[PDB]
Design an enzyme around this catalytic site. Structure first.
Site, PDB file in Angstrom:
ATOM      1  N   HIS A  90      39.545  45.922  44.345  1.00  0.00           N
ATOM      2  CA  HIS A  90      39.374  46.559  43.048  1.00  0.00           C
ATOM      3  C   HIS A  90      37.988  46.353  42.446  1.00  0.00           C
ATOM      4  O   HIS A  90      37.734  46.892  41.367  1.00  0.00           O
ATOM      5  CB  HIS A  90      40.453  46.130  42.059  1.00  0.00           C
ATOM      6  CG  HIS A  90      40.325  44.734  41.531  1.00  0.00           C
ATOM      7  ND1 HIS A  90      41.131  43.710  41.976  1.00  0.00           N
ATOM      8  CD2 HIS A  90      39.566  44.216  40.537  1.00  0.00           C
ATOM      9  CE1 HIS A  90      40.854  42.611  41.297  1.00  0.00           C
ATOM     10  NE2 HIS A  90      39.893  42.880  40.435  1.00  0.00           N
TER      11      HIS A  90
ATOM     12  N   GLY B  37      36.890  37.538  35.351  1.00  0.00           N
ATOM     13  CA  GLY B  37      35.866  37.253  36.335  1.00  0.00           C
ATOM     14  C   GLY B  37      36.276  36.287  37.431  1.00  0.00           C
ATOM     15  O   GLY B  37      35.450  35.974  38.302  1.00  0.00           O
TER      16      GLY B  37
ATOM     17  N   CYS C 167      38.667  36.798  39.770  1.00  0.00           N
ATOM     18  CA  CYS C 167      39.174  37.410  40.988  1.00  0.00           C
ATOM     19  C   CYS C 167      38.273  37.111  42.184  1.00  0.00           C
ATOM     20  O   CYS C 167      37.042  37.019  42.081  1.00  0.00           O
ATOM     21  CB  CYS C 167      39.318  38.924  40.779  1.00  0.00           C
ATOM     22  SG  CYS C 167      40.743  39.258  39.715  1.00  0.00           S
TER      23      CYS C 167
HETATM   24  C1  LIG Z   1      39.948  39.727  38.152  1.00  0.00           C
HETATM   25  O1  LIG Z   1      38.877  38.860  37.752  1.00  0.00           O
HETATM   26  C2  LIG Z   1      40.982  39.806  37.029  1.00  0.00           C
HETATM   27  C3  LIG Z   1      41.709  38.434  36.784  1.00  0.00           C
HETATM   28  C4  LIG Z   1      42.630  38.491  35.572  1.00  0.00           C
HETATM   29  C5  LIG Z   1      41.841  38.680  34.249  1.00  0.00           C
HETATM   30  C6  LIG Z   1      42.509  37.760  33.283  1.00  0.00           C
HETATM   31  N1  LIG Z   1      43.192  36.701  34.043  1.00  0.00           N
HETATM   32  C7  LIG Z   1      43.273  37.120  35.379  1.00  0.00           C
HETATM   33  O2  LIG Z   1      43.815  36.426  36.242  1.00  0.00           O
HETATM   34  N2  LIG Z   1      41.951  40.810  37.452  1.00  0.00           N
HETATM   35  C8  LIG Z   1      42.389  41.855  36.650  1.00  0.00           C
HETATM   36  O3  LIG Z   1      41.967  41.936  35.474  1.00  0.00           O
HETATM   37  C9  LIG Z   1      43.403  42.875  37.108  1.00  0.00           C
HETATM   38  C10 LIG Z   1      42.658  44.075  37.787  1.00  0.00           C
HETATM   39  C11 LIG Z   1      43.678  45.073  38.389  1.00  0.00           C
HETATM   40  C12 LIG Z   1      44.491  44.431  39.515  1.00  0.00           C
HETATM   41  C13 LIG Z   1      42.989  46.384  38.875  1.00  0.00           C
HETATM   42  N3  LIG Z   1      44.156  43.325  35.953  1.00  0.00           N
HETATM   43  C14 LIG Z   1      45.057  42.507  35.347  1.00  0.00           C
HETATM   44  O4  LIG Z   1      45.330  41.377  35.781  1.00  0.00           O
HETATM   45  O5  LIG Z   1      45.680  42.964  34.221  1.00  0.00           O
HETATM   46  C15 LIG Z   1      47.003  42.552  33.985  1.00  0.00           C
HETATM   47  C16 LIG Z   1      47.631  43.495  32.909  1.00  0.00           C
HETATM   48  C17 LIG Z   1      46.748  43.521  31.618  1.00  0.00           C
HETATM   49  C18 LIG Z   1      47.765  44.932  33.521  1.00  0.00           C
HETATM   50  S1  LIG Z   1      49.345  42.875  32.479  1.00  0.00           S
HETATM   51  C19 LIG Z   1      49.499  42.584  30.690  1.00  0.00           C
HETATM   52  C20 LIG Z   1      49.140  41.332  30.166  1.00  0.00           C
HETATM   53  C21 LIG Z   1      49.246  41.083  28.784  1.00  0.00           C
HETATM   54  C22 LIG Z   1      49.702  42.098  27.909  1.00  0.00           C
HETATM   55  C23 LIG Z   1      50.053  43.368  28.439  1.00  0.00           C
HETATM   56  C24 LIG Z   1      49.946  43.608  29.832  1.00  0.00           C
END
Ligand SMILES: *[C@H](O)[C@H](C[C@@H]1CCNC1=O)NC(=O)[C@H](CC(C)C)NC(=O)OCC(C)(C)Sc1ccccc1
Ligand SMILES: *[C@H](O)[C@H](C[C@@H]1CCNC1=O)NC(=O)[C@H](CC(C)C)NC(=O)OCC(C)(C)Sc1ccccc1
EC number: 3.4.19.12
Lengths: 301, 300
Positions: free
Chosen positions: B40, B142, B144
């Protein structure tokens, strides 16, 4: 949502060696062309019951110390004793030496321990220095000379070198200038940890963390003076706050808008009234081994 | 004493790099002449809502990928995609590549996480693969591309690469072949996990740890059969205990002189009566992220 996180250990791994005298082996720390280790390496098991370190050392020569990085011997070219640590000058500067400093920490401060055996790292974990100057570590025979540290930007601040396990299963040691934390001495004679207390500044940090995460039922409408709070806290076996404590809570106080002394007044009500079955950050227990820096390091990154 | 202990992270630190595509930055893992990272990274904000990754990737060129190892850019000379992981071929080999392999772990197993941001290591901690295939990590924006691993002798076994956080605050990711643990997908949509359970064999190992460290208020004079224990366990959403689990706990049973099924009887009482406000090894809850191997190693 909080866990003990250690610093990445690689910069310290690149500094661990083993030091042997006769059949006694422990760990040492190789920085530039000096190796630091606990002085009791020069003791036979029978010497340890009642050692005269000055006299044991005067009988030693550079050629009695076996220092190894892995199985590679590092030749010793000088030796001296500084409090409870031995300093061995070696003929090779460690090419993995990081930027570093030696610091003496205060109770309540946390650090990472790299537990090592025969100069080989086994595990890393976070410790807090207790107010009774012990740490709740995990150490086996052969762990002495393992070190504790913090990493700030590029720079490793070494703060702990391991020497001893007390009957209650907690641990004691020195700074890297060989000065013990607490009243302990490096002799194999019965010793005991004193009565411990709760690290108030860290509990407050924890309450700030709860607020940052939206858990704030315990905030009240009142405040207190620092002196009144300290006098009450001691009746609950909590540590008194110092001026330095108030200052290191500054960033969290600014982030939340909650004055340090108002948070003290909230904690006082918790001590005086109990939780009444409610939880904070999911727990009925107040955590005291997360510092204000640890909270910032995990809430805001 | 008894602490959650992570593996020393140095061998993994020497492999972390930064990977940027557009305005998206995350971490990669540089082994020999390949950099592994979450696919991604190639997405814009708009792409993440419903990405057709094969279609997005064919439209990228090698030069769209900026890889940095510290203050040095590495030139990408090739790329491919394996499930949810992107593999970037670079023109230089990592001399710090350790002996390593890629493994897929089972629920209940533990590993160390090296949390990284912009290719720089930030912290190290121990996690377990939950029965519902999430992990309870500490990851921020950040993070990931941060990886999870175990170390045996000199060999690093990589088992996890981080991809996402769920609404409940737990985390999800893939093995190093790019296949998710769990029913999750790398799309920007809210996703829930299945009901989690407690890892029973790990709770028993930790009870034995509490006894090795001289804490045994929870023991009792009673016993239980394996199946009667498992009936109660499942009622309380604990995983079943197998005979292999009993066997694996043997060393800890021998060390302490407490038969496994006697410790099962103790846990049964704890589940039925609670802890009465008491604590075990400092915890007010039954801890289930130490394996029998973890306990044995740290007590041997
Ligand atoms: C990559 O660095 C990132 C890690 C995440 C960010 C915050 N803590 C983590 O572990 N990965 C992502 O942001 C990921 C990218 C997609 C896979 C394309 N998205 C993600 O994790 O988002 C989760 C949600 C927001 C869709 S779930 C949610 C959480 C809280 C309220 C409503 C919905
Ligand atoms: C050095 O590797 C070693 C580390 C110890 C061994 C097991 N776990 C540890 O952390 N250090 C020692 O064995 C130490 C050496 C002396 C300080 C020279 N001795 C030690 O810690 O003994 C503890 C006592 C005798 C001071 S107190 C005690 C503890 C248990 C039972 C009775 C008394």
């Amino acid at each position: 949502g909080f866990r003990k996180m250690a610093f990445p250990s690689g910069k310290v791994e690149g500094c661990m060696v083993q030091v042997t005298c006769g059949t006694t082996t422990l760990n040492g720390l190789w920085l530039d062309d000096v190796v630091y280790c606990p002085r009791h390496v020069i003791c036979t098991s029978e010497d340890m019951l009642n050692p005269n370190y000055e006299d044991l050392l005067i009988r030693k020569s550079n050629h009695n110390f076996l220092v190894q990085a892995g199985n590679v011997q590092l030749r010793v070219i000088g030796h001296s004793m500084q409090n409870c640590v031995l300093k061995l000058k070696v003929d090779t500067a460690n090419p993995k030496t990081p930027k570093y400093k030696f610091v003496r920490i205060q109770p309540g401060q946390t650090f990472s321990v790299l537990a090592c055996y025969n100069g080989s790292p086994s595990g890393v974990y976070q410790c807090a220095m207790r107010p009774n100057f012990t740490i709740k570590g995990s150490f086996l025979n052969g762990s002495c000379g393992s070190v504790g540290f913090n990493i700030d930007y590029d720079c490793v601040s070494f703060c702990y070198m391991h020497h001893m396990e007390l009957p209650t299963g907690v641990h004691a040691g020195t700074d890297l200038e060989g000065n013990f934390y607490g009243p302990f001495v490096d002799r194999q004679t019965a010793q005991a940890a004193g009565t411990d207390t709760t690290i108030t500044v860290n509990v407050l940090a924890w309450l700030y963390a709860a607020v940052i995460n939206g858990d704030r039922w315990f905030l009240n409408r009142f405040t207190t003076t620092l002196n009144d709070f300290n006098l009450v806290a001691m009746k609950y076996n909590y540590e008194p706050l110092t001026q330095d404590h108030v200052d290191i809570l500054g960033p969290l106080s600014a982030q939340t808008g909650i004055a340090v002394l108002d948070m003290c007044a909230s904690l006082k009500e918790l001590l005086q009234n109990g939780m009444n079955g409610r939880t904070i950050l999911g727990s009925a227990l107040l955590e005291d081994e997360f510092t204000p820096f640890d909270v910032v390091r995990q809430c805001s990154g």
